[PDB]
Symmetry: C2
Subunit: 443 residues, 2 copies
């Protein structure tokens, strides 16, 4: 009573950050659930109010095109106006914010990364919510430093990585992917002052506690308990990392090559960025009815492809027609991450390797889905090149933790073959292309 | 050839590190499995061989004492004559060799940490095999570097860290927690240069492949499937961390306090040390027969305490007489770590907390054992102050990965009150006491 509580005056500012890291993690966990439950409302009101008479296929294709384009145009007009920095994932806009390179305007991003991400991702576009939640989370961590008035220089990098950790923890119910997002992915940007790593923990805890009360689901991806991977067959997860580790730098040259190729029909205009974003967001709404595996930001193709429900000629067709629809969305300037459309390209090429590995090897008794869970985090290690948070996020979402060894081998063969090929991390190459564009345009 | 020529000009010395880290990682899967199969064959040769108790009880308590003390005076003697750095855990001898301070004498530690870790830890003493596998692993990472005569200090800090991560991946069968030993626990010593981390990833998976070849994996601790905790009850995991976070600085105050206190009964001699080691390590083979939860490394009673086969008049006798046999065994110069004795120390105080919360709160319908898994990584976060190497290492040996939010909450409140109530990490306070005692030797 009177022998313990007098030590608060000794370290009053560390206990001022760790209390504020509890209100960062609470406010990010509310803004992430209202994102995910608010984007599922616009996705259920779209397909639910699509079929009306069930025999009017000319009008039903028109409604599926316009009602997903106007929602997408609401997410493209609110981005190039009033908040131009919320025009992509948001992981490069916080990686250049832990180091003092990019400004953090929470008064502009938070009514835009929320209300534009609800119209972009709610239009059936191939874009995930790992983008608009870590960017929202990185700005709520900046928001409480202007509400609670503190001008600390170490309390502004601590809370901005707290809500960024709380954004990944409250988007995928993944408390371990949120902490290791700051540790090993954002390694040259984090400080680790022994109180900042405790403040990341409170923000991750309070954002996953607020995921309990409104999301009573067991997993985000509903693939059950798959088979084990014996260590007679752990060399096929090294050939899987070789195949994924070569496509990774080729995909990063395709992301950054389509950001400049699509930036030629409009050239930077406002009346032509929006009309192009409605032609993209309407095409991914028109694809939501005629081919539901092509459109969408993953997470429904993922527990279907890993069960062997697709054929071989249809898994090749999806990988061609999902690369086209994920380079037309993320490499266009829409608020939405490339993360969840990379989880849907990992279970397609992973199963296409897993369906061939049971024809050449009948003596291994291989399941065709164990290469889809392992391949899911193998494009996150070759493109983004954050292999450890990309294999404690496939495990946190599919709950298939028995593949903890084969998912490292395909996460290590992907990182090793992406560095040998000549590939950069994707979230550090979008940031390095926006800083060099900022320096060369104002001069 | 074409590709063969261009892989030798630019990246040859980075590829020589990634090939050495596969030879380093393989050799801590053959010297780490045969260490665990040597302490388990010696365990079933002194307590499984002398099993007939129906004939002579006074002629068996001496055999349970003499056969476990003669093994104890082989390791208390090999350390004190041939490799004095091999005594104790061995993580502070790698934590203090990763930067510049202590040498890595693989020509002295490896015949002593092996055949003394077989003698003490396999001869019935309360010691964990994490310690004698990090130091054997880190010395192998220097041994292969010295045999192949690699040139540079960039590979010396690299390959010593791959072997210390190869040790944790095969002593406990955890590929994911071995990398977080180097990333999270070895934070201010390890150098991250984008090739050394892939040498750790190579050295870990080459040390877990060589586990399942010999030791066919299912789980170390055989708790089957505990109940998924309803996260209404997550505030009880914070008071579990508060209770452990107070005891944590009190516990390692006894660890360093008993190393100094036991240093007066023998002085610094080599006859009085093994005669102390023949009684302080000798009664734990006698306590391993009349009360087998009071002695031993502390892994047999973890499935017994978590399942709830104890009362709270026996859950105190295996905590009062379990801290005594842990401070006597580890903190007296015996070649054996303290991870597994403070793992059995967390699941006993966690079950005592678990058996109380099911009486005061019948509305929650709690299990008394879900706090035992959450309390296992609590003393590893309060004393060692490495939560993510404690709350991920016990998920991989118990195979209950649904308690992550109950364990990050317990791992936070353990770390938060071990910093407030001033407690340094155990392996950073053991090393800083051996650094100050070697600077007083030169004068
Ligand atoms: Cl972008
Ligand atoms: Cl989505
Ligand atoms: Cl020691
Ligand atoms: Cl042990």
């Amino acid at each position: 009573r009177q022998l313990i509580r007098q030590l608060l005056e000794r370290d009053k500012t560390p206990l001022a950050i760790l209390f504020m890291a509890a209100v960062v993690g609470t406010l990010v966990g509310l803004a992430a659930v209202a994102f995910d439950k608010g984007v599922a409302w616009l996705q259920n009101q779209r397909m639910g109010a699509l079929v009306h008479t069930a025999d009017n296929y000319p009008l039903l294709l028109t409604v599926a095109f316009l009602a997903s384009a106007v929602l997408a145009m609401f997410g493209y007009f609110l981005v190039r106006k009033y908040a131009p920095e919320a025009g992509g994932s948001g992981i490069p806009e916080i990686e250049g914010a832990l180091e003092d390179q990019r400004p953090v305007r929470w008064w502009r991003v938070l009514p835009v990364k929320f209300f534009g991400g609800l119209g972009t991702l709610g239009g059936g576009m191939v874009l995930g919510r790992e983008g608009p939640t870590v960017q929202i989370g990185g700005n709520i961590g900046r928001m409480v430093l202007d509400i609670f008035r503190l001008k600390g220089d170490e309390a502004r990098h601590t809370l901005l990585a707290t809500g960024a950790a709380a954004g990944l923890a409250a988007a995928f119910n993944a408390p371990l992917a949120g902490i290791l997002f700051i540790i090993e992915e954002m390694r040259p940007q984090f400080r680790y002052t022994l109180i900042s790593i405790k403040a990341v923990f409170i923000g991750v805890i309070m954002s996953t506690i607020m995921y309990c009360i409104f999301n009573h689901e067991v997993a985000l991806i509903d693939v059950g308990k798959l088979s084990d991977a014996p260590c007679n067959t752990l060399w096929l997860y090294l050939i899987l990392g070789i195949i994924f580790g070569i496509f990774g730098p080729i995909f990063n040259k395709w992301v950054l090559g389509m950001q400049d190729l699509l930036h030629r029909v409009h050239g930077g205009n406002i009346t032509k960025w929006v009309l192009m974003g409605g032609a993209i967001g309407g095409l991914c709404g028109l694809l939501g009815f005629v081919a539901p595996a092509t459109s969408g930001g993953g997470f429904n193709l993922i527990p279907i492809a890993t069960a062997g429900n697709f054929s071989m000629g249809m898994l090749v067709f999806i990988f061609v027609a999902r690369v086209i629809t994920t380079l037309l969305c993320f490499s266009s300037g829409a608020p939405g991450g490339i993360f969840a459309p990379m989880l849907a390209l990992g279970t397609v090429l992973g199963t296409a390797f897993g369906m061939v590995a049971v024809e050449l090897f009948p003596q291994y008794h291989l399941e065709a889905g164990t290469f889809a869970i392992a391949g899911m985090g193998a494009l996150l290690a070759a493109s983004i090149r954050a292999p450890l948070t990309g294999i404690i996020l496939v495990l946190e979402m599919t709950d298939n933790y028995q593949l903890i060894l084969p998912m490292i081998i395909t996460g290590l063969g992907a990182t090793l073959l992406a560095q040998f090929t000549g590939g950069k991390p994707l979230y550090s190459a979008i940031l390095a292309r926006t800083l060099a564009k900022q320096e060369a345009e104002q001069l």
